[PDB]
Amino acid sequence: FHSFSFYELKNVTNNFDERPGNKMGEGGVVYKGYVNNTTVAVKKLEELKQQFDQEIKVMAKCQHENLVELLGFSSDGDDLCLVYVYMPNGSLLDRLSCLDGTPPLSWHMRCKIAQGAANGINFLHENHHIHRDIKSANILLDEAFTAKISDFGLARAQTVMTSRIVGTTAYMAPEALRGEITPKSDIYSFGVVLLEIITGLPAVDEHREPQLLLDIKEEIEDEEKTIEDYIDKKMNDADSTSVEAMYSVASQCLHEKKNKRPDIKKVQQLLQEMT
């Protein structure tokens, strides 16, 4: 990776222009820039340095079509910047909420994104990495709306435990909330992402009943609700067979027992059969 000068980065971003005009960031703060006349994303950041070091270490060995591409970094400055190829269509989270007036994603786009995200996670697991923060805010979208997994700062290379429990509560598997580190926890988080794709609903909403999205799985299983009551209404091209095939994958990912969950290869294979 290229070791960019802080002065070069500090100014490809107009002295880190906090007005939306270079800012956007919510990772770390992300700024848009231009280096070797490539549009770039400059993410400006103690334990923060450890997450910076881990980001470069994971990015060094993990290069895939469904993972963000790190181009460089800056450390000899004031301080800690990570340079990536810019993702013009932002996050899956933002696009699901139609932030800033963007059109809703079609079912066809959503199927290609679920498939892409799964291929990205499969690569990580084959390369013996546990992401630990799988969520729609960490699924980025390029110029063709190709899903790219991001944020490897908390990544690790069952039976493993930690005294510093990390991740996003609304996406976390029960064992992850207790400190276990397992690739099975990434499967659970991906199940929540599949529910976000089907429903267009965020994983957590304080002003909603139920507050947590994963709670709909029980409403459907108790015959209290159907997946059809929850399908995002901002689509015209969804069909029952593929929505049901995707919900069945999400439901399997969301098994409370980590051992009963499918592996990423099974998930990837099921989403492929869905199309």
Ligand SMILES: COC(=O)N1CCN([C@H]2CC[C@H](Nc3ncnc4ccc(C#N)cc34)CC2)CC1
């Ligand atoms: C009020 O709230 C907003 O306006 N919001 C919500 C947060 N959003 C995100 C900001 C960061 C952005 N992140 C990025 N954007 C482009 N390219 C990238 C390449 C790599 C990486 C990484 N690792 C990150 C990137 C994704 C969207 C922007 C709108």
